[PDB]
Amino acid sequence: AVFQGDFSESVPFLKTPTNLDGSLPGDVGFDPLGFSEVFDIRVLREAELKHGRIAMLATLGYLVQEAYVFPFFDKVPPIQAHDVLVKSGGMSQILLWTSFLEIFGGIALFQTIQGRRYPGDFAFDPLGLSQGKNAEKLERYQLAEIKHSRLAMLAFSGFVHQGFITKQGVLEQLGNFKPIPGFPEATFF
Amino acid sequence: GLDGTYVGDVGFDPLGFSSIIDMRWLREAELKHGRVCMLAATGMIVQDVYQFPGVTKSFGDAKMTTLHDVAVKQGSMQQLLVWLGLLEIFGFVAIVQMLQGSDRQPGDFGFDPLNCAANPDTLARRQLVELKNGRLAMIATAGMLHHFFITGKGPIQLIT
Amino acid sequence: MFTLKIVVYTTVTLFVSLFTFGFLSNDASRNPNRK
Amino acid sequence: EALGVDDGRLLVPLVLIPVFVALLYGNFASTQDNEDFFDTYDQRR
Amino acid sequence: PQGFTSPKNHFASVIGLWVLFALPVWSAAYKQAGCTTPDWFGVSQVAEDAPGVGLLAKAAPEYNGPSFREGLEYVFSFVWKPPILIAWKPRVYDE
Amino acid sequence: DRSYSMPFLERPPALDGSLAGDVGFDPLGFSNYFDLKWLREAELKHGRVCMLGCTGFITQEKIQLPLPGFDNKVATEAFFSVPAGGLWQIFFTLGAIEILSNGGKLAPGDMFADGRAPGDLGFDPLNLSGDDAALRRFILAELKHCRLAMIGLGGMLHQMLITKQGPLDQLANFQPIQYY
Amino acid sequence: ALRTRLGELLRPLNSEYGKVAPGWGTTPIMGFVMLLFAVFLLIILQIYNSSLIIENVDVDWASLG
Ligand code: CLA
Ligand code: CLA
Ligand code: CLA
Ligand code: KC2
Ligand code: KC2
Ligand SMILES: CC1=C(C#C/C(C)=C/C=C/C(C)=C/C=C/C=C(C)/C=C/C=C(\C)C#CC2=C(C)C[C@@H](O)CC2(C)C)C(C)(C)C[C@H](O)C1
Ligand SMILES: CC1=CCCC(C)(C)[C@H]1/C=C/C(C)=C/C=C/C(C)=C/C=C/C=C(C)/C=C/C=C(C)/C=C/C1=C(C)CCCC1(C)C
C-alpha cells in the first residue's frame, strides 16, 4: 500500500482478515476472500491439516511408485494403479481402514467445534519428537507442517496434472524435459 | 459528483457517470483500462518490430487480432487468461475491501519495487502522468486495432 | 384421439382432485351439531 | 402404460391440476388452527 | 459386485455421508463465525443516490386497498372497457 | 405529481420511492388493484426463474451432461428429448422448494402474513445484505437483471422456435427469417 | 329488487329513462339521412326492376357465369 495504511502482511493491499489472528500456526494473514468469516477458523484448520497430511504422503508415493513397485504388485504408471487396485479390491481395503480411522476422527472434529481439542491434534506423537523435553520444538514444527502441507498439496496437484499433459512420469520429465506434445512442431497458422 | 480530490480532475463528466457509480470504482477502472492499454499498445508496436525466438514458425505472419485467433489454439492465450484471472481474483478482493471501508486508494496495488514514489510530491506528478498516458493509450490502442481492421496492416507496417 | 384423451384426462383429474381435497377440508365439522 | 399414459403430455394434466387445487386447499389449510385436538374429530373450522 | 457390495455404491455412500455431515460441521463453524465482522459488508460501485435505489431496504407497504378479485376485474376491464372512447364524449326529462 | 419513467402520466399513487426499482412505470395501474408485495414477489420470482433459465439456454448449447438424450443443443428441442420422468422429478423438487421456502403460506392472502418482505426467502449464504445502502443498491440490480432476463428469455425462446437454433449458434450463421 | 354483479355492471345503461334533448334535437339530420335512404332504396329497386341500367351491371341469372 504505497499510500500509508494499516494492512495485511502477505498482501499489502488488503486489511488483516478479521477473526484471523497470529495464533494459528503459519498465519501470514492471507485469506483474501474471507472463508474464515463464513466458517470457523478451527474447523477450516482441521481441513488444511487433513488435506495436507493426506497430500504429503501422496507426493512421496507418486514419486516412490514411479521408481519402485512392491514385487507382488505390477509396476504401472500410478494413475493406472488406482484402476488396477480398484478392480483388485485393494483400494476398497484402503478405503475401509481409512474410513474406520476417519470415524474416530469425525467425533474429534465435533469436540473441536465444541471447544475441547485444538484443531488437528490427535495426540499422535509415538516418537519423542516434540516430547516434553522437546516441547519447545512443537511451535516450530507446527509451522513446518502447515508449510510442508501447503506445498505438498500444490506439488501433487502439479505432478498429476503435468503427468497427464506430458504423458511423461515426473522423474522422467525432470531428466528428459520436453514441451507439451506438438508445440515445437505445430503451427496454429 | 465530481470533486477536486481525485487526481486528473479537469471536471469533464458530460454524461454524468459519476452521479450513478462510485468514483472509487470509476477510477479503479480508468486506471486498470489504462494500465492494460499502455501495455497493449506497447505490445502491438513491439510485436511488429521483434518476435520471441520460436514464435514466427508456430504462428507465422498473423498479427494483431488475427494473431489472437491463432494464439488461442497454441493455448498461449489460455495461460494468459488463467494467470491474469488469478491476479484479478485478488483484484476483486481489493475492490471489495476498498468499497467496504478500507485504506487502499483506487488503483493502488502496492507495486513500487524501485521505491519511485517514496517522495510524496513526486508521486502526485506521476499519478497525473499515469492517467494521461493511459487515457492516450486507450485512444491509441483502439485506433491501432481499427486501423488494422480496415487496412489489414500492423501499425509500424502502416507507418512503413 | 389424443385430444379427446387429454380432454377426458383433464376433466377426470379435475373432478377427482376436487373430490379428494373437498373431503380433506375437515368434512366431519360440516354437521349441524358442530359448535 | 403406468396410468394409461402413452404420451408424456397426458402427465401435464395429472400433475398441474392436482397441484393447483392443492394450492387453493393450502390457503384453507393455512387458515385453520392446526394445534392438536384430543377428540374424535376437529370442530375448529 | 452389485448393490451393497458394489464399490461404486461404497463411493456413493461415502459421498452421501460427507453431504450429511456437511450441515452439522460447517453449520457449527458458521455459527461460531458467521461473517459477523465489522469490516464484512457488501460493496457496490454505484452511487447510493442513483435512480431506482429505494429509500429503505425490504419495503413492505400495507396495501389497504382493493381485493384480488377487483384487480382481476380491472385487468379484464382493460380488454372489455378501455378508456379509449371516453375521450370523445358528446355534450331534460320528458313528463 | 408525474411519473419519472412516463413524464406525461401521473405518478401511480401507490408507487412511492420506498419499493426498489421504482421509476413510476405502472401506466396501466396494476399497482392500484393488487398488493405490491404480491406483485414484487412475482417480478422477482419470474426474473430469478429466468436468470437461471437464460443462463440455462446458453450453457446447454455449449456443454451437455453425459447421460443419453441430454445431447440436444437447442433448449426448446431438448425439452422433448430428455426423459419425461426427470422433468417431473425437477418439477416436484422445485415444488417442495416452494412450500418449504414460503413455509406453506403459498397464497396471495397468506404468503406475506408473517413478515417475509417480498423475495426474502432467506437465501443470503454469504451475508451481503448487512449494509443497508448496499442492500438498497443490490436490490435495484436484481430487478434490473430480472427485467432484462424476462425480455431475453422470451426473445431466445421465440427466436429458437423460428430458427431451430440455440442463441449463440443462430447469431453465428444468422440467416434471414425467409430462409428458415 | 335483487342486486347482482351483472345488474350493477349494466345499470348505467338503463339509468336515463325519459331523458330527452330540447326541442327538435337532431331532427333535420334524421330527415336528411332518411331522404338519402329513400333515394338509395329507389335506386336499388329500379335496378332489380330493370327500370334503371347501371353500366357494368346485368340483373340476370346469366351474369353468374
Ligand atoms: C490388520 C488388518 C488387516 C487385514 C487382516 C487385511 C486383510 C487384507 N488386505 Mg489389507 N490393509 C490393512 C489392514 C488389513 N488388511 C490396512 C490398515 C491397510 C491400509 C489402509 C491395508 C491396505 C491394503 C491394500 C492396499 C490391499 C490390502 C489387501 C488385503 C487382502 C488380501 C490379503 C493378502 O494380500 O494376502 C495375504 C497377505 C499376505 C500374503 C501378506 C503377508 C501378511 C503376513 C503374513 C501377516 C502379518 C500379520 C497381518 C498383517 C495381520 C496384522 C494384524 C495382527 C498383527 C493382529 C486381505 C483381505 C489387498 C486386496 O484388496 O486384495 C487384492 C490389497 O491390495 N490391504
Ligand atoms: C473507460 C475509461 C475511463 C473511465 C472509467 C473514466 C472515469 C473517470 N474519468 Mg476519465 N477519461 C477517459 C477514460 C475514462 N475515464 C479518457 C479516454 C479521457 C480522455 C478523453 C478521459 C478524460 C478525463 C478528464 C479530463 C476527467 C476525467 C474524469 C473522470 C471521472 C469522472 C468522469 C465520469 O463520471 O465519467 C466516467 C467515465 C465513463 C463512464 C466513461 C464513458 C465512456 C463511454 C461514453 C461509455 C459508453 C458505454 C460503453 C461503451 C459500454 C461498454 C462497457 C463494457 C465494455 C463493460 C471518472 C473517475 C474527471 C475527473 O478526474 O474527476 C475526478 C476529469 O476531470 N476523465
Ligand atoms: C408443486 C409445485 C408448485 C407449487 C405448489 C408452487 C407454489 C407457488 N408458486 Mg410456483 N412454480 C413452480 C412450482 C410450484 N409452485 C415451478 C416448478 C415453477 C417454475 C420454475 C414455478 C414458478 C412460479 C412463478 C413464476 C410464480 C410462482 C408462484 C407461486 C406461489 C403462488 C401460487 C399461485 O397462486 O399460483 C396459482 C396459479 C396461477 C395464478 C396461474 C399462473 C398465472 C398465469 C401463468 C399468468 C399468465 C400471464 C399472461 C401470460 C400475460 C398476459 C399477456 C398479455 C398479452 C395479455 C405459490 C407459493 C407465484 C408467486 O409467488 O406469486 C407471488 C409466481 O409469481 N411459481
Ligand atoms: C434437482 C432435482 C432432482 C432431485 C432433488 C432428485 C433426487 C433424486 C433422489 C432423491 C434423493 C433419487 C433416489 C433420484 C434417483 C434418480 N434420478 Mg433424480 N433427482 C433430481 C433431478 C433429476 C433429473 C433431472 C433426472 C433424474 C434421474 C434419476 C434416475 C434415473 C432413472 C433411470 O435410471 O433411468 C434415478 C434413479 C433421471 C431420470 O429419472 O431419467 C429417467 C433424470 O433425467 N433426477 N433422484
Ligand atoms: C522466454 C523467451 C521466449 C518466449 C516468450 C517464447 C514464446 C514462444 C511462443 C509464444 C507464443 C511460441 C509458440 C514459441 C514457439 C517455439 N519456441 Mg519460443 N519463446 C521464447 C524463447 C525461446 C528459446 C530460447 C527457444 C525457443 C524455441 C521454440 C521452438 C522450437 C522448435 C521450432 O523451432 O520449431 C518453438 C516452436 C527453441 C528453438 O528451437 O528456437 C528456434 C529455443 O531454443 N523459444 N515460443
Ligand atoms: C504461499 C506460501 C508458500 C509458498 C509457495 C509456492 C512455492 C507456490 C507455488 C505456486 C504455483 C507454482 C502455482 C502454480 C500454478 C500453475 C497453474 C495454476 C497452471 C495452470 C495451467 C493452466 C490453467 C493451463 C493450461 C493449458 C494451456 C496453457 C493450453 C492447453 O493447450 C493445455 C493446458 C491445459 C496445459 C509456502 C508454503 C512456502 C509457505 C507459506 O506458508 C505461504
Ligand atoms: C419455448 C417452449 C419450448 C421449450 C420448453 C417449453 C416449456 C415447451 C417452452 C418454454 C417456454 C417459455 C419460457 C416461453 C415464454 C417466454 C419468454 C420468457 C417471454 C418473453 C417475452 C418478452 C416480451 C415480448 C417483451 C417485450 C419487452 C418490452 C417491449 C420492453 C419494453 C420496455 C418498457 C415497456 C418501457 C421502457 C423500455 C422498453 C424497451 C420500451
Resolution (Å units) = 2.2
State the amino acid at position E7 in one-letter form: P
State the amino acid at position A188 in one-letter form: F
**Residue F142 contacts residue F57 (beta carbons within 8 Å):** no
This structure was determined by cryo-EM
Give the residue, out of B51, B58, B61, with the most ligand 5 atoms within 8 A of its beta carbon, to mutate for a pocket test: B58
B21 lies within 8 A of chain E by CB: yes
Q: Does B1 contact E47 at a Cβ distance shorter than 8 Å?
A: yes
Q: Quick one: which H or E segment has residue D16?
A: helix D11-31
Which residues on neighbouring strands pair with residue E46, listed in sequence order? Answer: B21
d(CA B89, CA A166): 29
- Strand ranges in chain F using DSSP code E only, listed in sequence order: none
Q: Which residues fall within 8 angstroms of residue A23, CB to CB, at 6 or more apart?
A: none
Nearest residue (by CA) to ligand 3, atom 38, is D20
Cα dist. B69→B34, B65, B75, B80 in Å?
24, 7, 10, 14
Main-chain dihedrals φ then ψ at residue B21, nearest 5 degrees: -120, 140
Ligand 6 in reach of B75 Cβ (< 6 A) = yes
Number of other CB atoms surrounding residue F147 within 10 Å: 15
Number of other CB atoms surrounding residue A41 within 10 Å: 23
Ligand 3 in reach of F87 Cβ (< 6 A) = no
Q: Does A186 contact B94 at a Cβ distance shorter than 8 Å?
A: no
d(CA E91, CA B110): 79
Chain A contact residues (CB < 8 Å to B): 1-7, 11-15, 32-33, 183-184, 186-189
d(CA B129, CA B155): 24
Q: Which of F15, F23, F33, F37 to mutate to test the interface with E (most CBs of E within 10 A)?
A: F33
d(CA E25, CA A83): 32
Number of other CB atoms surrounding residue F152 within 10 Å: 18
Number of other CB atoms surrounding residue F4 within 10 Å: 13
Give the residue, out of A10, A154, A185, with the most ligand 6 atoms within 8 A of its beta carbon, to mutate for a pocket test: A154
Ligand 1 in reach of A47 Cβ (< 6 A) = no
Q: Which residues fall within 8 angstroms of residue B109, CB to CB, at 6 or more apart?
A: A12, A13, B91, B94
What is the maximum alpha-carbon separation in chain E? 102
End-to-end CA distance of chain G: 62
E4 lies within 8 A of chain B by CB: no
d(CA B65, CA B148): 8
Q: Which of F79, F90, F98, F105 to mutate to test the interface with D (most CBs of D within 10 A)?
A: F105
Cα dist. A63→A37, A57, B67, E17, F69 in Å?
37, 10, 40, 32, 42
Ligand 5 in reach of B77 Cβ (< 6 A) = no
**Residue A179 contacts residue B50 (beta carbons within 8 Å):** no
d(CA B159, CA A59): 55
H and E: helices and strands count for chain F? 6, 0
F79 lies within 8 A of chain D by CB: no
Closest Cα partner for A26 from A143, A149, A150?
Answer: A143
For F87, half-sphere exposure in the C-beta direction (CA atoms, 13 angstrom radius) is: 14
**8-state DSSP, F68:** T
Nearest residue (by CA) to ligand 6, atom 24, is B79
- Sign of CA pseudo-dihedral E51, E53, E54, E55: negative
| 3-state secondary structure at position F55 | helix
Out of D10, D25, D32, whose CB is closest to C21?
Answer: D25
Question: Could you write out the DSSP letters of every residue in A152-180?
Answer: HHHHHHHHHHHHHHH-S-HHHHHHS--PS
Q: Which residues fall within 8 angstroms of residue F135, CB to CB, at 6 or more apart?
A: E42, E57, E58, F129
Closest Cα partner for C25 from D34, D23, D25, F103?
Answer: D25
Q: Which residues fall within 8 angstroms of residue B110, CB to CB, at 6 or more apart?
A: A1, A2, A12, A13
Q: Does B99 contact E46 at a Cβ distance shorter than 8 Å?
A: no
Q: Does C29 contact D43 at a Cβ distance shorter than 8 Å?
A: yes
Out of D8, D11, D23, whose CB is closest to F107?
Answer: D23
**In chain G, what are the helix, strand and coil shares in percent, each to the nearest 5?**
55, 0, 45
d(CA F159, CA B34): 39
C-alpha cell at A172: 522422467
* Count of all residues that appear for chain B in the document: 160
**8-state DSSP, E46:** B
